[PDB]
Design a binder for this molecule. Structure first.
Ligand SMILES: [Cl-]
Length: 287
């Protein structure tokens, strides 16, 4: 039996990675390129919609529309759960990981309290895994997952410390079906990492919710995607595995029917999946 819906949301502060970013990586990388920062590249690049790492709005943008909330989206493509980014060259200009986004949000309040009614949305950890696999990190995956969990818990604790009361924390996504992971023959490694994050994180957040009297909702993105991918026709999806917009090894022309695709590029879902995800995330809240 379902429990009562949570109270309405009028403001979201979003923290996270390319699965949330609504233009910050684009703004920041244009700033970095203008300053001549070593190794800077324009992100996300040309085959993306208005600076989103997709062909349309991210899930948190759809969530805000569903709930009738304003969105302040701090997320940065590449953001890790700690201070920095998959793109190590950013560290010289700005700490854009979840911890860096939290620090910047708390430092820009301008002598105003944190809004205790605002929903603090946290969606991060994929870049921890992709960095580890792409650049041979030395942590066993179990230790990498423990650091991801610890980093996310520390972010909720630090936001709560400053006055945040309401949270929505997203689980690991199903990294094991991401086209770049399949092509890297890393499906088992992704399964092991995401299972360790998703078993431990909700246990840590439930303890912190009770200690600090938080409203904290956990969104199981893995259960969500398994249901979509087992019943694709129900949702108008046809192609679950091929990217609509190939980029590896090179950019090729986009598919004609993107709303029937799961993946936009080799890492990121389409606007269609972001829409279904944001609808699903809104399900715990009254409008
Ligand atoms: Cl990312």
């Amino acid at each position: 039996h379902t429990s009562p819906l949570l109270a309405p949301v009028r403001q979201i502060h979003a923290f996270g990675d390319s699965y949330s970013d609504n233009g910050e990586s684009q703004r920041l990388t244009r700033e970095m390129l203008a300053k001549g920062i070593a190794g800077a590249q324009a992100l996300p690049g040309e085959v993306y919609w208005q600076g989103r790492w997709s062909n349309g709005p991210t899930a948190v943008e759809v969530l805000a529309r569903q709930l009738g909330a304003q969105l302040a989206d701090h997320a940065v493509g590449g953001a890790k759960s700690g201070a920095d980014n998959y793109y190590g060259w950013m560290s010289a200009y700005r700490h854009t990981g979840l911890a860096g986004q939290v620090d910047a949000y708390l430092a820009t309040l301008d002598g105003k309290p944190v809004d205790g009614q605002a929903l603090h949305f946290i969606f991060v950890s994929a870049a921890d895994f992709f960095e580890h696999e792409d650049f041979a990190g030395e942590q066993p995956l179990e230790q990498l997952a423990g650091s991801s969990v610890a980093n996310i818990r520390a972010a909720v604790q630090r936001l709560g410390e400053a006055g945040a009361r309401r949270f929505l924390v997203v689980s690991s996504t199903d990294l094991s079906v991401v086209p770049a992971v399949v092509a890297g023959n890393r499906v088992e490694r992704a399964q092991r990492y995401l299972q360790a994050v998703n078993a431990s994180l909700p246990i840590q957040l439930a303890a912190l919710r009770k200690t600090r009297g938080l409203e904290l909702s956990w969104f199981d993105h893995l259960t969500f995607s398994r249901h979509l991918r087992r019943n694709p026709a129900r949702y108008g999806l046809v192609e679950l595995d091929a990217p609509c917009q190939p980029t590896q090894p090179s950019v090729r022309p986009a598919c004609a029917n993107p709303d029937q695709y799961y993946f936009w590029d080799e890492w990121h879902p389409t606007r269609r999946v972001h829409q279904l995800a944001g609808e699903a995330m809104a399900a715990r809240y009254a409008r």
